[PDB]
Symmetry: C4
Subunit: 387 residues, 4 copies
């Protein structure tokens, strides 16, 4: 076992090849499948796993009732092999959690699970499944984290947490973690910015996080930092607006775009110099569709001009959260960090007539070979028997 | 593989971080989950497992009928990874048993499973799943043991067994076990004491057991011993009374507290010099709630004064048995033996209107970092379909 | 990996300690559990497994209909860890089979699965799951084998097969198998003997098989042989008659006891010089109860006098087949081959009002420490929903 | 780990011994079993696995509705151990796919999964579960592949893909793949030939593929090639016609036999000089029965004369696709490549009155020891509850 280096740059990619699909909701009609949301993928140097927040309940059972609710003492962070349905028969228990992150440093898994009251939640950090640290809410207002993988470089792993309002100014901290122990943290000085649910990836020994402004931004905020937590902040400048909801595409801003800026969805993007690969919903107003868009000047430039779109989920189909995950050279044998992404396909409440909310997932990896657009949606027929 | 040393002292702890939650009863509404009681956790130098006594039946099936009953030829000791629901698809078979213990010496698992008639029960000891010894009832009155992990030091493991009445004087024996073979035993000379269901942990090469006085004590008895089975006995002196039922807190005794002393619940406590960490129910009269209390003078002093309470399960929620488990330095990389605990959350009979009784579990580990009180209860909605 | 020696003698045993119980039928009321019969246990130098003949169907499903029937193209030999219920989620596939045997030589598993028409059945031999030999019926009348483990000594494994009538003289062959290849066979010259379903175990470099005379013997036939297949034959002489059905105990014979001799049940016994440990049903007329009896002169002497009985299953409870299995020194660390046994607890047809027949299992290992009699029966409540 | 050589010739075989049977459809009546079709087997140097295209749904659940349909975004390539039922609790996720292939080079698994639109489908190649290449449709008309294992020789693996009409001339390409990367491809110049769903096996360092002519041939086309993709083409000359549908046996042709040539079924055959082992349906008009036929002159000669038939599935029972798989010397310890085959037993639509279509499987391996004909059919009773 050797620590992941994380010093190479992101692989160049022309399109996105399909990597996995679990069909969780379709299978959970009959099989014993957890009610989940906030899924994400992360890889060790030997496998990729799907992590997820269960609701302590199965699909099509009465305890799925009320699962629109975000935070309870029943929620647990669990994981299973990528592409398999999350069941009690194939899932590893990770942590008690209603917000989470996880990543592998090359030697062992770090998991981060936040539970406890809204006014005093505690993140429990584990390394190889042993508790190695805790951090308690410093603003007493829903201490919360990425809902996607943390990022590792040279034996350290990194994450972002938020505490305070989700509809106004809050407080955002970056953490350096070594063998599950917090060895440094910094509070970002980011007045008028809003960071939620960051998608963070390593690139050339530094971390780049693309997050969600749930306050007053329909473009996405970003924070980038090196191993010592020296950080910079901005918003993606492209007029191909990344959040949901958002306005129609038009001239962008390098600061938060107020139009349709309140609310949001977890997302990601990958920076390539001045260019950006953006994943987003197809609808400007709800969690429908998914597409990947290459804007060669979109990280730093404000026009609404792009060079490539690839369809992922059709406009009339349900999408949800999305996030980055990477495959490092130690896993792939490549000379670059391979970028991949996942999409959560949310079914049930609030859009559909059910007692429950749950999701399935799809994922893709970036390649420089031929790809195609299509739609790979959830495919379950709702409502279910229990509804 | 190397034997666990067990020579370091208990880690200092300021609070209890949440470690696991299985949601067994909620999941067993639909999934194939064993009817269980008497769960406990124990760790090897590589993983922690949940051990439990099944009823040879699944939740929501007719064979769960009558599972208030303690002893039958259908009960088996099985185990699964911590935090996973106990199913026939993820559980390792250990022993035929209606009372049990288990622990790992650093090389292999010892399990102890008692079965047979009330007038002549036999404990079957296994090391790495091979039968290595038996011990038969010496009082012909329900030979029985810890219902939690045994404790290992320097290649030997240790347990306590009781035979005789549960409402009067009985007989209590301590055993030293090496590779599943009993190499020494002693009968404790403890007139007017009652020991049931001991929670035993290693600390500085000696074993400390905190047990249940089911006869006439609402504080908890203790027995401590070294590897040669030279032992001392007492009761926890604190007026923060540890058993359930019990009286309201008041001046304690270093002997059995007669008030509300009959009956009891399995529990634990950790000794730190003159101080004690006590886990107990919140109700004085039934198995409701759970809390951890630090009394800095409570091992040896009789006042009802404490310095720290942390809530675990709310007063209006069902609790049940609780027990110690430790994580040794060989597992954690620490310089001390880490104390942890589990709580059984009992659902069904006798408190609820069901044909069945079963439990889920929560667990916590001691840390010297920030923690919080909350309630993490079972969460199943009873009755079930089968009722 | 090293070949099992099989050169030590059988461990001396005073009684039988309980080793496993699966509760298959009770669990299969709800869980996904195979309809099985003809279970047996066998151990490698690392684990013990339960082998069984499935009916290609689950309990409580319509395809369990008609499972009184012995031979079909749907039956498969599968295995799972000892004490676990045989499900499609925990069972390894071994062979297509309606009669079987299996054993581990110290390096790999041999399995033997017989399938095909009654007039031309073929045994398929596999070593480490690769087909290594076949043997075809030589009498065109239900080629069939042990339904329990084969026996290994010094890199060779041994079994017995029968072809011809089950109610008259048939033909019986002994086979020596090396890495799944038949290297020698002999036809036993045994006029007026009947051998079915042999329970064969190694002892002092030789194999002893105790079988079932389904023709005209209520005591059990035996055949013993060395590695070169030089063999001797006899019947257990004790008047503690071993088969079911049988007469009440009285003076025995060293030849087949005609009284109630037609029909039978698979069984076993262990030879200790002139003495014998006999396992048998408690009823003389049906598959009810189980008990172990030590007769110190019963291998070679004809009196109905015994020195020890231990109860296993009560007289009013269903039993079924039973068989030997051993644990060699390479597994246990002992200086002798440890004798163990299993009992099949048959439920459904023909004794009960169901569409189906299936079994659960119990097992025990011989020890020289304290033991007790009891009853550990199946415990399912019939009929089931599907009936 | 060492690359498979693939330089020895095919083992000589006199008959086919039964290797596995899963009973998937029978078990899926109650258990949680995927709706599948297009199953196939492939082996590593350590195990054999069943690969299959799921429909993202379970048997006896409403999402099995409409599963006669071939191509959807819900279909996934998954695998499980040979002989086990394909469930979400025992199946490894491989790829998103509605057409597939897989094989092991001695070091790692290659999988090939085709998904996307009919007018632009993309094959995603993975080596050890990491995406290593893609190939996009070059004729924009259902890019598609073997539905059975690819073939490996000396660190390279080989497959055939088709793009264009299934009822007229299409385009056929052969690919050489090294560690999941396409290192060479060639378009076969095969005017008036039709290649679908090739069964390809290694033999003496070359690959032989026997396929399906869905255009105008009731005998089977073949293509053989060496590692550099120098290829030859023909049709099996025997008058024992291999496809379904077909005419009654009569004088054959070395070119496509037009009589009943439209449509087809995936199949295989093994070449032994001028002779051929043919597997085929028993019915000339539908997917009923299965039999193996040795024609000692049938590869190159046109008579309808044969030397050996062995029955596999009875004339009145449902069959389906069939395919080759091999076991190399590195797995078996033999000096030749062992030929084996599988049969898909298709149940449901279009032949039966159900909402769904799914299959079970049987397999056999070639031996030079005694064998027998029989019928090992699916055995499920249709319709099911959901119908
Ligand atoms: C902004 C970050 C964060 C601030 C607490 O909130 C996150 C947002 C979401 P999100 O998917 O946007 O929520 C959908 C709400 C649907 C409301 C429907 C109303 N109908 N009814 N009843 C889910 C997350 N688990 C949640 N995180 C935590 C930790 O709770
Ligand atoms: C005191 C130790 C021991 C002495 C035999 O009894 C233990 C106590 C308990 P406990 O949880 O306190 O029992 C709850 C009784 C509820 C009675 C309800 C009445 N309604 N009805 N019908 C469970 C344990 N398995 C049991 N051990 C064994 C070996 O049987
Ligand atoms: C004697 C050896 C052998 C000779 C073929 O027969 C064995 C005997 C039995 P056994 O348990 O004794 O059978 C119970 C019969 C119950 C009949 C009930 C009648 N009611 N109805 N319908 C099971 C075995 N699988 C069977 N072996 C094979 C290979 O078929
Ligand atoms: C010829 C190769 C290929 C050309 C696209 O078609 C293959 C043929 C079959 P096949 O088993 O022959 O199809 C059975 C059709 C039954 C029709 C019943 C009509 N009733 N209704 N509604 C299955 C395969 N998945 C399919 N491959 C792909 C990639 O779709
Ligand atoms: C990353 O570090 C490795 C190991 O020293 C080195 O070979 C490589 O050049 C670095 N890569 C980049 C892209 O900087
Ligand atoms: C869901 O919860 C509501 C409100 O507590 C209740 O009225 C309803 O019956 C529940 N439904 C189910 C299926 O449990
Ligand atoms: C990586 O960490 C090592 C060891 O802590 C440190 O000495 C070094 O500066 C770091 N290397 C890089 C390339 O950032
Ligand atoms: C326990 O033993 C180890 C190994 O000899 C030693 O380093 C350590 O000091 C001991 N610890 C204590 C706390 O006594
Ligand atoms: C439970 O057992 C009782 C008493 O034997 C019986 O009357 C009742 O019907 C049973 N219930 C179920 C669901 O089996
Ligand atoms: C531990 O056991 C060893 C070996 O049996 C013994 O010699 C020694 O006294 C013990 N050590 C301690 C530290 O108790
Ligand atoms: C069996 O063989 C071993 C190894 O040579 C030897 O030590 C032993 O004496 C033999 N045992 C008996 C009981 O013959
Ligand atoms: C069992 O089979 C019989 C006879 O074929 C049939 O009449 C009966 O309905 C079947 N029962 C079930 C539950 O399938
Ligand atoms: C065991 O097998 C070996 C090797 O085939 C042989 O030489 C020897 O005679 C046998 N030994 C015993 C103790 O039977
Ligand atoms: C295949 O290669 C091996 C290894 O060099 C060699 O021993 C063998 O003769 C070859 N086999 C054939 C049948 O050509
Ligand atoms: C199957 O689909 C058809 C057509 O969409 C529908 O009318 C029918 O009810 C469905 N059946 C089930 C069991 O879902
Ligand atoms: C096998 O591959 C090697 C290495 O690429 C090559 O040098 C050789 O020609 C090939 N050998 C055979 C026997 O085809
Ligand atoms: Ca926003
Ligand atoms: Ca008490
Ligand atoms: Ca008889
Ligand atoms: Ca054709």
């Amino acid at each position: 076992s050797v620590k992941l280096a994380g010093n190479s740059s992101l692989c160049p990619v022309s399109g996105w090849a399909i990597y996995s699909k679990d069909n969780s909701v379709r299978i959970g009609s009959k099989g014993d499948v957890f009610v989940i949301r906030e899924p994400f993928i992360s890889c060790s140097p030997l496998e990729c796993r799907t992590f997820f927040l269960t609701q302590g309940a199965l699909l099509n059972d009465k305890h799925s009732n009320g699962t629109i609710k975000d935070r309870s003492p029943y929620r647990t962070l669990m994981s299973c092999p990528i592409g398999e349905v999350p069941s009690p028969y194939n899932s590893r228990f990770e942590s008690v959690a209603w917000s989470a992150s996880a990543c592998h440093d090359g030697i062992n898994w770090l998991t981060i699970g936040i539970s406890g009251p809204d006014n005093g939640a505690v993140a429990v950090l584990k390394y190889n499944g042993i508790i190695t640290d805790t951090i308690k809410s410093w603003r007493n207002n829903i201490l919360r984290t990425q809902e996607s993988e943390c990022a590792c470089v040279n034996g350290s792993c990194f994450t972002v947490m938020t505490d305070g309002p989700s509809n106004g100014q809050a407080s955002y901290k970056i953490f350096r973690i070594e063998k599950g122990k917090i060895v440094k943290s910094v509070e970002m000085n980011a007045p008028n910015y809003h960071y939620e649910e960051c998608s963070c990836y390593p690139d050339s020994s530094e971390i780049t996080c693309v997050c969600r402004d749930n306050w007053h931004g329909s473009n996405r905020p970003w924070v980038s930092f090196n191993q010592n937590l020296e950080y910079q902040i901005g918003y993606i400048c492209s007029g191909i607006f990344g959040d949901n909801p958002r306005p129609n595409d038009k001239t962008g801003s390098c600061g938060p775009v107020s139009s349709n800026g309140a609310n949001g969805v977890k997302g990601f993007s990958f920076k390539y110099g001045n260019g950006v690969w953006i994943g987003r919903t197809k609808s400007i107003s709800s969690r429908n569709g998914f597409e990947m868009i290459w804007d060669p000047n979109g990280w730093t430039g404000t026009d609404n001009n792009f060079s490539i779109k690839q369809d992922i989920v059709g406009i009339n189909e349900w999408s949800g959260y999305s996030g980055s995950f990477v495959q490092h050279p130690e896993l792939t044998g490549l000379d670059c960090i391979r970028p991949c992404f996942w999409v959560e396909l949310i079914r049930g409440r609030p859009k559909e007539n059910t007692i429950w909310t749950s999701g399935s997932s799809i994922s893709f990896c970036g390649v420089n070979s031929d790809t195609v657009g299509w739609s790979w949606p959830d495919g379950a027929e709702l409502p279910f028997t229990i509804d």
